[PDB]
Design a protein around this nucleic acid. Structure first.
Ligand SMILES: [K+]
Ligand SMILES: [K+]
Ligand SMILES: [Mg+2]
Ligand SMILES: [Mg+2]
Ligand SMILES: [Mg+2]
Ligand SMILES: [Mg+2]
Ligand SMILES: [Mg+2]
Ligand SMILES: [Mg+2]
Ligand SMILES: [Mg+2]
Ligand SMILES: [Mg+2]
Ligand SMILES: [Mg+2]
Ligand SMILES: [Mg+2]
Ligand SMILES: [Mg+2]
Ligand SMILES: [Mg+2]
Ligand SMILES: [Mg+2]
Ligand SMILES: [Mg+2]
Ligand SMILES: [Mg+2]
Ligand SMILES: [Mg+2]
Ligand SMILES: [Mg+2]
Ligand SMILES: [Mg+2]
Ligand SMILES: [Mg+2]
Ligand SMILES: [Mg+2]
Ligand SMILES: [Mg+2]
Ligand SMILES: [Mg+2]
Ligand SMILES: [Mg+2]
Ligand SMILES: [Mg+2]
Ligand SMILES: [Mg+2]
Ligand SMILES: [Mg+2]
Ligand SMILES: [Mg+2]
Ligand SMILES: [Mg+2]
Ligand SMILES: [Mg+2]
Ligand SMILES: [Mg+2]
Ligand SMILES: [Mg+2]
Ligand SMILES: [Mg+2]
Ligand SMILES: [Mg+2]
Ligand SMILES: [Mg+2]
Ligand SMILES: [Mg+2]
Ligand SMILES: [Mg+2]
Ligand SMILES: [Mg+2]
Ligand SMILES: [Mg+2]
Ligand SMILES: [Mg+2]
Ligand SMILES: [Mg+2]
Ligand SMILES: [Mg+2]
Ligand SMILES: [Mg+2]
Ligand SMILES: [Mg+2]
Ligand SMILES: [Mg+2]
Ligand SMILES: [Mg+2]
Ligand SMILES: [Mg+2]
Ligand SMILES: [Mg+2]
Ligand SMILES: [Mg+2]
Ligand SMILES: [Mg+2]
Ligand SMILES: [Mg+2]
Ligand SMILES: [Mg+2]
Ligand SMILES: [Mg+2]
Ligand SMILES: [Mg+2]
Ligand SMILES: [Mg+2]
Ligand SMILES: [Mg+2]
Ligand SMILES: [Mg+2]
Ligand SMILES: [Mg+2]
Ligand SMILES: [Mg+2]
Ligand SMILES: [Mg+2]
Ligand SMILES: [Mg+2]
Ligand SMILES: [Mg+2]
Ligand SMILES: [Mg+2]
Ligand SMILES: [Mg+2]
Ligand SMILES: [Mg+2]
Ligand SMILES: [Mg+2]
Ligand SMILES: [Mg+2]
Ligand SMILES: [Mg+2]
Ligand SMILES: [Mg+2]
Ligand SMILES: [Mg+2]
Ligand SMILES: [Mg+2]
Ligand SMILES: [Mg+2]
Ligand SMILES: [Mg+2]
Ligand SMILES: [Mg+2]
Ligand SMILES: [Mg+2]
Ligand SMILES: [Mg+2]
Ligand SMILES: [Mg+2]
Ligand SMILES: [Mg+2]
Ligand SMILES: [Mg+2]
Ligand SMILES: [Mg+2]
Ligand SMILES: [Mg+2]
Ligand SMILES: [Mg+2]
Ligand SMILES: [Mg+2]
Ligand SMILES: [Mg+2]
Ligand SMILES: [Mg+2]
Ligand SMILES: [Mg+2]
Ligand SMILES: [Mg+2]
Ligand SMILES: [Mg+2]
Ligand SMILES: [Mg+2]
Ligand SMILES: [Mg+2]
Ligand SMILES: [Mg+2]
Ligand SMILES: [Mg+2]
Ligand SMILES: [Mg+2]
Ligand SMILES: [Mg+2]
Ligand SMILES: [Mg+2]
Ligand SMILES: [Mg+2]
Ligand SMILES: [Mg+2]
Ligand SMILES: [Mg+2]
Ligand SMILES: [Mg+2]
Ligand SMILES: [Mg+2]
Ligand SMILES: [Mg+2]
Ligand SMILES: [Mg+2]
Ligand SMILES: [Mg+2]
Ligand SMILES: [Mg+2]
Ligand SMILES: [Mg+2]
Ligand SMILES: [Mg+2]
Ligand SMILES: [Mg+2]
Ligand SMILES: [Mg+2]
Ligand SMILES: [Mg+2]
Ligand SMILES: [Mg+2]
Ligand SMILES: [Mg+2]
Ligand SMILES: [Mg+2]
Ligand SMILES: [Mg+2]
Ligand SMILES: [Mg+2]
Ligand SMILES: [Mg+2]
Ligand SMILES: [Mg+2]
Ligand SMILES: [Mg+2]
Ligand SMILES: [Mg+2]
Ligand SMILES: [Mg+2]
Ligand SMILES: [Mg+2]
Ligand SMILES: [Mg+2]
Ligand SMILES: [Mg+2]
Ligand SMILES: [Mg+2]
Ligand SMILES: [Mg+2]
Ligand SMILES: [Mg+2]
Ligand SMILES: [Mg+2]
Ligand SMILES: [Mg+2]
Ligand SMILES: [Mg+2]
Ligand SMILES: [Mg+2]
Ligand SMILES: [Mg+2]
Ligand SMILES: [Mg+2]
Ligand SMILES: [Mg+2]
Ligand SMILES: [Mg+2]
Ligand SMILES: [Mg+2]
Ligand SMILES: [Mg+2]
Ligand SMILES: [Mg+2]
Ligand SMILES: [Mg+2]
Ligand SMILES: [Mg+2]
Ligand SMILES: [Mg+2]
Ligand SMILES: [Mg+2]
Ligand SMILES: [Mg+2]
Ligand SMILES: [Mg+2]
Ligand SMILES: [Mg+2]
Ligand SMILES: [Mg+2]
Ligand SMILES: [Mg+2]
Ligand SMILES: [Mg+2]
Ligand SMILES: [Mg+2]
Ligand SMILES: [Mg+2]
Ligand SMILES: [Mg+2]
Ligand SMILES: [Mg+2]
Ligand SMILES: [Mg+2]
Ligand SMILES: [Mg+2]
Ligand SMILES: [Mg+2]
Ligand SMILES: [Mg+2]
Ligand SMILES: [Mg+2]
Ligand SMILES: [Mg+2]
Ligand SMILES: [Mg+2]
Ligand SMILES: [Mg+2]
Ligand SMILES: [Mg+2]
Ligand SMILES: [Mg+2]
Ligand SMILES: [Mg+2]
Ligand SMILES: [Mg+2]
Ligand SMILES: [Mg+2]
Ligand SMILES: [Mg+2]
Ligand SMILES: [Mg+2]
Ligand SMILES: [Mg+2]
Ligand SMILES: [Mg+2]
Ligand SMILES: [Mg+2]
Ligand SMILES: [Mg+2]
Ligand SMILES: [Mg+2]
Ligand SMILES: [Mg+2]
Ligand SMILES: [Mg+2]
Ligand SMILES: [Mg+2]
Ligand SMILES: [Mg+2]
Ligand SMILES: [Mg+2]
Ligand SMILES: [Mg+2]
Ligand SMILES: [Mg+2]
Ligand SMILES: [Mg+2]
Ligand SMILES: [Mg+2]
Ligand SMILES: [Mg+2]
Ligand SMILES: [Mg+2]
Ligand SMILES: [Mg+2]
Ligand SMILES: [Mg+2]
Ligand SMILES: [Mg+2]
Ligand SMILES: [Mg+2]
Ligand SMILES: [Mg+2]
Ligand SMILES: [Mg+2]
Ligand SMILES: [Mg+2]
Ligand SMILES: [Mg+2]
Ligand SMILES: [Mg+2]
Ligand SMILES: [Mg+2]
Ligand SMILES: [Mg+2]
Ligand SMILES: [Mg+2]
Ligand SMILES: [Mg+2]
Ligand SMILES: [Mg+2]
Ligand SMILES: [Mg+2]
Ligand SMILES: [Mg+2]
Ligand SMILES: [Mg+2]
Ligand SMILES: [Mg+2]
Ligand SMILES: [Mg+2]
Ligand SMILES: [Mg+2]
Ligand SMILES: [Mg+2]
Ligand SMILES: [Mg+2]
Ligand SMILES: [Mg+2]
Ligand SMILES: [Mg+2]
Ligand SMILES: [Mg+2]
Ligand SMILES: [Mg+2]
Ligand SMILES: [Mg+2]
Ligand SMILES: [Mg+2]
Ligand SMILES: [Mg+2]
Ligand SMILES: [Mg+2]
Ligand SMILES: [Mg+2]
Ligand SMILES: [Mg+2]
Ligand SMILES: [Mg+2]
Ligand SMILES: [Mg+2]
Ligand SMILES: [Mg+2]
Ligand SMILES: [Mg+2]
Ligand SMILES: [Mg+2]
Ligand SMILES: [Mg+2]
Ligand SMILES: [Mg+2]
Ligand SMILES: [Mg+2]
Ligand SMILES: [Mg+2]
Ligand SMILES: [Mg+2]
Ligand SMILES: [Mg+2]
Ligand SMILES: [Mg+2]
Ligand SMILES: [Mg+2]
Ligand SMILES: [Mg+2]
Ligand SMILES: [Mg+2]
Ligand SMILES: [Mg+2]
Ligand SMILES: [Mg+2]
Ligand SMILES: [Mg+2]
Ligand SMILES: [Mg+2]
Ligand SMILES: [Mg+2]
Ligand SMILES: [Mg+2]
Ligand SMILES: [Mg+2]
Ligand SMILES: [Mg+2]
Ligand SMILES: [Mg+2]
Ligand SMILES: [Mg+2]
Ligand SMILES: [Mg+2]
Ligand SMILES: [Mg+2]
Ligand SMILES: [Mg+2]
Ligand SMILES: [Mg+2]
Ligand SMILES: [Mg+2]
Ligand SMILES: [Mg+2]
Ligand SMILES: [Mg+2]
Ligand SMILES: [Mg+2]
Ligand SMILES: [Mg+2]
Ligand SMILES: [Mg+2]
Ligand SMILES: [Mg+2]
Ligand SMILES: [Mg+2]
Ligand SMILES: [Mg+2]
Ligand SMILES: [Mg+2]
Ligand SMILES: [Mg+2]
Ligand SMILES: [Mg+2]
Ligand SMILES: [Mg+2]
Ligand SMILES: [Mg+2]
Ligand SMILES: [Mg+2]
Ligand SMILES: [Mg+2]
Ligand SMILES: [Mg+2]
Ligand SMILES: [Mg+2]
Ligand SMILES: [Mg+2]
Ligand SMILES: [Mg+2]
Ligand SMILES: [Mg+2]
Ligand SMILES: [Mg+2]
Ligand SMILES: [Mg+2]
Ligand SMILES: [Mg+2]
Ligand SMILES: [Mg+2]
Ligand SMILES: [Mg+2]
Ligand SMILES: [Mg+2]
Ligand SMILES: [Mg+2]
Ligand SMILES: [Mg+2]
Ligand SMILES: [Mg+2]
Ligand SMILES: [Mg+2]
Ligand SMILES: [Mg+2]
Ligand SMILES: [Mg+2]
Ligand SMILES: [Mg+2]
Ligand SMILES: [Mg+2]
Ligand SMILES: [Mg+2]
Lengths: 60, 45, 77, 92, 102
RNA sequence: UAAGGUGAUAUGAACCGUUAUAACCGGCGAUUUCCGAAUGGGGAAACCCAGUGUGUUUCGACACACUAUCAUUAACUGAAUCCAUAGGUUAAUGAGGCGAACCGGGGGAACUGAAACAUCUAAGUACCCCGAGGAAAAGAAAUCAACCGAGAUUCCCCCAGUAGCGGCGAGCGAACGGGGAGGAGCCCAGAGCCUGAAUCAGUGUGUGUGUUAGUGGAAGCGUCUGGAAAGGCGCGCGAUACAGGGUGACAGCCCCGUACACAAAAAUGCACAUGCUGUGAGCUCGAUGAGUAGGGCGGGACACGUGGUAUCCUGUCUGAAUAUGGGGGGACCAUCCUCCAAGGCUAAAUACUCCUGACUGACCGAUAGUGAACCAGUACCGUGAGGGAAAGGCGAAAAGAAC
RNA sequence: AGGACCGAACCGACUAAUGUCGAAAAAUUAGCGGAUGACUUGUGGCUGGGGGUGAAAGGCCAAUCAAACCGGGAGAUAGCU
RNA sequence: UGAAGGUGUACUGUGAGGUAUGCUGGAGGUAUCAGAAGUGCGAAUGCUGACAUAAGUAACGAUAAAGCGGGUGAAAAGCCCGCUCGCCGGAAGACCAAGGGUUCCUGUCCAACGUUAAUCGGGGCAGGGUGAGUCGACCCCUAAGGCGAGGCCGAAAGGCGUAGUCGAUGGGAAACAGGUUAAUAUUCCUGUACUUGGUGUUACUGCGAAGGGGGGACGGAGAAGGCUAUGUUGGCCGGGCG
RNA sequence: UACGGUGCUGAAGCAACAAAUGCCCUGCUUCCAGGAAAAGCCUCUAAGCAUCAGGUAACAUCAAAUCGUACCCCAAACCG
């Protein structure tokens, strides 16, 4: 996914960060503690996918 | 019948604390010793 | 500190030998005096803490020549 | 007002008797917040993420319990809870 | 460069199951393979309350050391040592004596 | 590189992969909470509290940067006071703290020995402080020598427990000279004709050939005991590989290595060309370090304790000649000899090992070896500085004992 | 008014018995002295080792004091056991 | 086809010793002649661990005191419920500070810890529980005192100290009643309040410190007067007729 | 009635007298040993500034962050 995310606009790449934070991380974090979430692996890969983006948009 | 240790955390820290040790040339060497020995509790804090 | 500004004479140590050669530690302090020197270059008095031998170096050389050497080391006066 | 960071404040909803009794009778929600997380930040976060009308947020810091097991001592992390009172327009 | 690997027919060189053959289920990090129908150990599996609770003895396939097994040739009809060579761009294994590729 | 991966106690759950976009190992980055020199002010370290500007914002306010001190440097500027100076402003650059030993300096004991003890010794030792560097100090003769000669310094071996010093006691103890390691010299106190030439100096720069990942890497078989064979016995085979470790007992040939042959997209350490912001040889001519050498006084250093005491250093008071000049040759003098002080710089041989890599031990094997083989500077003890333990091993495999 | 009187709290510590491997490395019990003063006590500060402090006893300075405690010189030295 | 070690036995040398072997043990051992030593233990009020003895002895921590019935339970003198009895009550009650640091509360468990037992516990194991504009800290000011740009002084380290800046135990805005949780409440709830700021409109109008002044703002003792907290007795109210 | 209670109702809800070491009282008399400081607070103006900026009231609206809050506390939870 990195090779695909690298070719993106600086304004457009924030929307993926905000989409990763808005739902996904928050939603899975709230859903995990309530005991509704079976798939625990999603918490890990989302956190890594944020890091990827937040690394990628540090171009200056 | 009244023993020697009559605790007070203000007194404790003002007397033996990290900043109390940092303040002085000799107090900095104490820390340098405890670090050199490799102590977990460097001061009482 | 008891240090001549001109020569750099500071207090050396040594013994104080008795008739029976009992070595007791002492110090030899230099003959320091705060003295005002007229600097004729810029028309003013300059106060310097100098040894009696300092004064003789200032007499031998020029006060300005000594102040030139003082300014090179990074001193005040 | 503090976009992106508001998402990191609310950790989880708290589950207990005291938490439950305060749902129906007091109209509040108890929840685990970040160790930072001011009452304004918790309010503003609930106002956006949960999207409900917040009356007032009360907050406290819970101290971690020293669980000694086997032969080693180990203390839990200090976590902050927030009793968030809701207005009459309520749900969850 | 592991010589014994996942889908590979082996033969046992040492141990109570000396001479038997089987496929490797999985190699471990410690340097031990689990070959099927080899080290059959009769474990006493305790009936754990949560999830399944069968309550009975079971013949598990225990691990064996990698150096106790060698890959089966299926041509000579016996154990054979493995090598490594560069056929084409990629690296591949080969049998020492009767130099074929796996 | 890769067919098993998601570190450990330590499993589970949910997953992730298989010829490469899983993991794994390196090079270069990105992130890098708070404290801590801690540096915006404070503070009972991991906290409290701001200023200034900037940029958005729904009244509420968010975000990021700056803002310590000091020392040089520069511009604004600038009081008593005419001129300036003191001072005050911001900016440029640097410093600050930590760390094993080794190193150079500033200070500097005592127990002890002297069969007591005070000179002396222990000893410029322990310790304290300051400042460095990969080494540091020294260092290119105002040095020795003995009428012969040598030629900076440091380090090793002798000289030699010698000559000396010494309540001539205890003790301290050279030098000359010789053999070795290692070698190297220069620059200012400046005019000449002429000048970028020797030189060391930016940095690129191809280079070499190391370092940080790695790749290949030979040849075993049947029987006999046995839980298990690597062991016994029989037949082989490799060996620039029989170092070593693992494997159910002791394996050259089962595995991992090994000898050996190799290997870099990227970062770096060295060793030769080398364009050069930026740097002068050779000449002639000169000059050639003054409160200095020396002295008196008091101390200290020299093996040398004031002794007949040279030489060196300087707290103190003095005070030359300055190359037909002066220093030294162990009081001192006269001849002879030798050097050029009062300004600097300089690699190697030398010391050390917090730390990194490999290898080695007539070194230890759990009361030993580190205090610490084990989650130890831990538990624990002390207000504190600080002190400071005990505690290794089921089995080949958990097959860790269903019922 | 009072370094006045009697007397609880509070500060003390004269007598006795108990206790002395204690309940306690200084206490208990019953009596006892002061109790508006040179009183007492909380909280925080300051004074440091030949030094402090001392209505003075060589008392006190973390259960240690005719020279604290910790680390170092250090395996001081011991014609002694 | 059984090493070292452990444990017996039998021989054997003048001795220290040596040899052979049964059992245990389950992988090491080592002739010979040489070489080197952390080379031999009964004592050192030796050092560390283990284990005895006294001894099933003293003791079981205030002479405030228990008793019974029922309950749970493998088991009850001690835990739970009940009823009597007892003891404190200027405390042995009830709130705090300091200091501890989860001991709180709930469920559960009784190995160890509790000077006995334990179903119990401040014990083990899980899970809960600490809600503030007004209470406290923070902040604002300062005391003693600490630090301290410049500075003055000191071999170095550092000492003192100015401007400042810290430093409460002191000064400085405001919340009360009742209700509620197994465990917090001046914090939650309900009912009534209050304070200091920021920010818009109106009607006015002479405002502004590093400065001046006021205030904050202060001792011992004593004596009186008025009050209240509070208590007592009637009154009223609800039960009561033993 | 899980024997726990719990929602509902809920009578009187006055007067006298006594009374503090509390409060008025940081008062009052009184004495000698002669009894913090600094901000908050009110006030006054310089340097400044004049349809400004500020103040003032009445009002509306926001804002009041952060950390402590359990429990023991003359004690089995502190110092021994
Ligand atoms: K010594
Ligand atoms: K009763
Ligand atoms: Mg960045
Ligand atoms: Mg103190
Ligand atoms: Mg030191
Ligand atoms: Mg230490
Ligand atoms: Mg500590
Ligand atoms: Mg001496
Ligand atoms: Mg004057
Ligand atoms: Mg509220
Ligand atoms: Mg709070
Ligand atoms: Mg933790
Ligand atoms: Mg690999
Ligand atoms: Mg699944
Ligand atoms: Mg990738
Ligand atoms: Mg990649
Ligand atoms: Mg990092
Ligand atoms: Mg600071
Ligand atoms: Mg900065
Ligand atoms: Mg800076
Ligand atoms: Mg700061
Ligand atoms: Mg404070
Ligand atoms: Mg200038
Ligand atoms: Mg002016
Ligand atoms: Mg002027
Ligand atoms: Mg700056
Ligand atoms: Mg800069
Ligand atoms: Mg420096
Ligand atoms: Mg430095
Ligand atoms: Mg040195
Ligand atoms: Mg040194
Ligand atoms: Mg030295
Ligand atoms: Mg010296
Ligand atoms: Mg002596
Ligand atoms: Mg002596
Ligand atoms: Mg002697
Ligand atoms: Mg003697
Ligand atoms: Mg004597
Ligand atoms: Mg020295
Ligand atoms: Mg030192
Ligand atoms: Mg230093
Ligand atoms: Mg080197
Ligand atoms: Mg360098
Ligand atoms: Mg050098
Ligand atoms: Mg030099
Ligand atoms: Mg020289
Ligand atoms: Mg020269
Ligand atoms: Mg020459
Ligand atoms: Mg020469
Ligand atoms: Mg000749
Ligand atoms: Mg020659
Ligand atoms: Mg020679
Ligand atoms: Mg004599
Ligand atoms: Mg000597
Ligand atoms: Mg000697
Ligand atoms: Mg010769
Ligand atoms: Mg020769
Ligand atoms: Mg020589
Ligand atoms: Mg030579
Ligand atoms: Mg050599
Ligand atoms: Mg050479
Ligand atoms: Mg040579
Ligand atoms: Mg050479
Ligand atoms: Mg030459
Ligand atoms: Mg030369
Ligand atoms: Mg000159
Ligand atoms: Mg090469
Ligand atoms: Mg390989
Ligand atoms: Mg191989
Ligand atoms: Mg067979
Ligand atoms: Mg067979
Ligand atoms: Mg046979
Ligand atoms: Mg058989
Ligand atoms: Mg069998
Ligand atoms: Mg075999
Ligand atoms: Mg055999
Ligand atoms: Mg043969
Ligand atoms: Mg071999
Ligand atoms: Mg075995
Ligand atoms: Mg053999
Ligand atoms: Mg073989
Ligand atoms: Mg081997
Ligand atoms: Mg062989
Ligand atoms: Mg080679
Ligand atoms: Mg390359
Ligand atoms: Mg390549
Ligand atoms: Mg490259
Ligand atoms: Mg010269
Ligand atoms: Mg000169
Ligand atoms: Mg001379
Ligand atoms: Mg002289
Ligand atoms: Mg002379
Ligand atoms: Mg001379
Ligand atoms: Mg002289
Ligand atoms: Mg004379
Ligand atoms: Mg003289
Ligand atoms: Mg002299
Ligand atoms: Mg003398
Ligand atoms: Mg001498
Ligand atoms: Mg003599
Ligand atoms: Mg004589
Ligand atoms: Mg002479
Ligand atoms: Mg000359
Ligand atoms: Mg000449
Ligand atoms: Mg000449
Ligand atoms: Mg002459
Ligand atoms: Mg001459
Ligand atoms: Mg000479
Ligand atoms: Mg000489
Ligand atoms: Mg002469
Ligand atoms: Mg002579
Ligand atoms: Mg001589
Ligand atoms: Mg001589
Ligand atoms: Mg002469
Ligand atoms: Mg000269
Ligand atoms: Mg010459
Ligand atoms: Mg000279
Ligand atoms: Mg010279
Ligand atoms: Mg000289
Ligand atoms: Mg000189
Ligand atoms: Mg010279
Ligand atoms: Mg150099
Ligand atoms: Mg070199
Ligand atoms: Mg070797
Ligand atoms: Mg060997
Ligand atoms: Mg060894
Ligand atoms: Mg061993
Ligand atoms: Mg050990
Ligand atoms: Mg052992
Ligand atoms: Mg042991
Ligand atoms: Mg130790
Ligand atoms: Mg402690
Ligand atoms: Mg063991
Ligand atoms: Mg094991
Ligand atoms: Mg094992
Ligand atoms: Mg069993
Ligand atoms: Mg009086
Ligand atoms: Mg009285
Ligand atoms: Mg009377
Ligand atoms: Mg009486
Ligand atoms: Mg009391
Ligand atoms: Mg008493
Ligand atoms: Mg007493
Ligand atoms: Mg009597
Ligand atoms: Mg009695
Ligand atoms: Mg007794
Ligand atoms: Mg007794
Ligand atoms: Mg009594
Ligand atoms: Mg009486
Ligand atoms: Mg009486
Ligand atoms: Mg009386
Ligand atoms: Mg007291
Ligand atoms: Mg105090
Ligand atoms: Mg003090
Ligand atoms: Mg002393
Ligand atoms: Mg001392
Ligand atoms: Mg002193
Ligand atoms: Mg004194
Ligand atoms: Mg007194
Ligand atoms: Mg006496
Ligand atoms: Mg004492
Ligand atoms: Mg005494
Ligand atoms: Mg003494
Ligand atoms: Mg003494
Ligand atoms: Mg002490
Ligand atoms: Mg030593
Ligand atoms: Mg001794
Ligand atoms: Mg047999
Ligand atoms: Mg046999
Ligand atoms: Mg045999
Ligand atoms: Mg046997
Ligand atoms: Mg047998
Ligand atoms: Mg046997
Ligand atoms: Mg052995
Ligand atoms: Mg034997
Ligand atoms: Mg037996
Ligand atoms: Mg026996
Ligand atoms: Mg035998
Ligand atoms: Mg047998
Ligand atoms: Mg056996
Ligand atoms: Mg073994
Ligand atoms: Mg072995
Ligand atoms: Mg062997
Ligand atoms: Mg043997
Ligand atoms: Mg041998
Ligand atoms: Mg030897
Ligand atoms: Mg021995
Ligand atoms: Mg013995
Ligand atoms: Mg023994
Ligand atoms: Mg033991
Ligand atoms: Mg009994
Ligand atoms: Mg008896
Ligand atoms: Mg008896
Ligand atoms: Mg008894
Ligand atoms: Mg008893
Ligand atoms: Mg009793
Ligand atoms: Mg009883
Ligand atoms: Mg029943
Ligand atoms: Mg029953
Ligand atoms: Mg039961
Ligand atoms: Mg029953
Ligand atoms: Mg039952
Ligand atoms: Mg039953
Ligand atoms: Mg039963
Ligand atoms: Mg019963
Ligand atoms: Mg009962
Ligand atoms: Mg009882
Ligand atoms: Mg009861
Ligand atoms: Mg009850
Ligand atoms: Mg009573
Ligand atoms: Mg009463
Ligand atoms: Mg309270
Ligand atoms: Mg405690
Ligand atoms: Mg705590
Ligand atoms: Mg606990
Ligand atoms: Mg409880
Ligand atoms: Mg139970
Ligand atoms: Mg039992
Ligand atoms: Mg247990
Ligand atoms: Mg018990
Ligand atoms: Mg006991
Ligand atoms: Mg319980
Ligand atoms: Mg508990
Ligand atoms: Mg608050
Ligand atoms: Mg109040
Ligand atoms: Mg405070
Ligand atoms: Mg604040
Ligand atoms: Mg203020
Ligand atoms: Mg302040
Ligand atoms: Mg003051
Ligand atoms: Mg101050
Ligand atoms: Mg100061
Ligand atoms: Mg400044
Ligand atoms: Mg300065
Ligand atoms: Mg200063
Ligand atoms: Mg002065
Ligand atoms: Mg100071
Ligand atoms: Mg001041
Ligand atoms: Mg306070
Ligand atoms: Mg207040
Ligand atoms: Mg207050
Ligand atoms: Mg209030
Ligand atoms: Mg109330
Ligand atoms: Mg109510
Ligand atoms: Mg109600
Ligand atoms: Mg409570
Ligand atoms: Mg309300
Ligand atoms: Mg209302
Ligand atoms: Mg109303
Ligand atoms: Mg109202
Ligand atoms: Mg009011
Ligand atoms: Mg208001
Ligand atoms: Mg005022
Ligand atoms: Mg007051
Ligand atoms: Mg008064
Ligand atoms: Mg009176
Ligand atoms: Mg009256
Ligand atoms: Mg009255
Ligand atoms: Mg009333
Ligand atoms: Mg009332
Ligand atoms: Mg009545
Ligand atoms: Mg009736
Ligand atoms: Mg009757
Ligand atoms: Mg009831
Ligand atoms: Mg009345
Ligand atoms: Mg009363
Ligand atoms: Mg007044
Ligand atoms: Mg006001
Ligand atoms: Mg007004
Ligand atoms: Mg609001
Ligand atoms: Mg609010
Ligand atoms: Mg409470
Ligand atoms: Mg209570
Ligand atoms: Mg209680
Ligand atoms: Mg209480
Ligand atoms: Mg008491
Ligand atoms: Mg109580
Ligand atoms: Mg005790
Ligand atoms: Mg206790």
């Amino acid at each position: 996914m990195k090779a695909k995310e690298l070719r993106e606009k600086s304004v457009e790449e924030l929307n993926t960060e905000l989409l990763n934070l808005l739902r996904e991380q928050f939603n899975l974090r709230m859903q995990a503690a309530s005991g509704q979430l079976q798939q625990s692996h999603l918490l890990k890969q989302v956190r890594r996918d944020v890091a990827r983006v937040k690394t990628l948009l540090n171009e200056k | 019948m009244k023993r020697t240790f009559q605790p007070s955390v203000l007194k404790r820290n003002r007397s033996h604390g990290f900043r109390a040790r940092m303040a002085t040339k000799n107090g900095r060497q104490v820390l340098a010793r405890r670090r050199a020995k490799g102590r977990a509790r460097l001061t009482v804090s | 500190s008891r240090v001549c500004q001109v020569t750099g004479k500071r207090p050396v140590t040594g013994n104080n030998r008795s008739h029976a050669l009992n070595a007791t530690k002492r110090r030899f302090l230099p003959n320091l005096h705060s003295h005002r020197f007229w600097v004729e270059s810029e028309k003013r008095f300059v106060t310097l803490r100098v040894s009696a031998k300092g004064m003789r170096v200032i007499d031998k050389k020029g006060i300005d020549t000594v102040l030139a050497e003082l300014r090179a080391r990074g001193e005040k006066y | 007002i503090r976009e992106e960071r508001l998402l990191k404040v609310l950790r989880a909803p708290h589950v207990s008797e005291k938490a439950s009794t305060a749902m129906e009778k007091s109209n509040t929600i108890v929840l685990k917040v970040a160790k930072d997380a001011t009452k304004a930040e918790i309010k503003a976060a609930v106002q956006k993420l949960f999207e409900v009308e917040v009356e007032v947020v009360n907050t406290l810091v819970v101290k971690g319990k020293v669980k000694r097991h086997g032969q080693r001592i180990g203390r839990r992390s200090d976590w902050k809870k927030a009793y968030v009172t809701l207005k009459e327009g309520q749900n969850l | 460069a592991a010589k014994i690997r996942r889908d590979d027919e082996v033969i046992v060189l040492t141990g109570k199951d000396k001479g038997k053959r089987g496929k490797v289920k999985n190699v471990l990090s410690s340097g031990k393979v689990i070959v099927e129908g080899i080290n059959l150990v009769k474990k006493h599996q305790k009936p754990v309350p949560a999830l399944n609770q069968p309550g009975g003895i079971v013949e598990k396939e225990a691990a064996i050391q990698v150096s106790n097994v060698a890959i089966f040739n299926a041509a000579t009809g016996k154990a054979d040592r493995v090598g490594f060579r560069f056929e084409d761009g990629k690296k591949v294994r080969f049998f020492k004596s009767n130099s074929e590729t796996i």
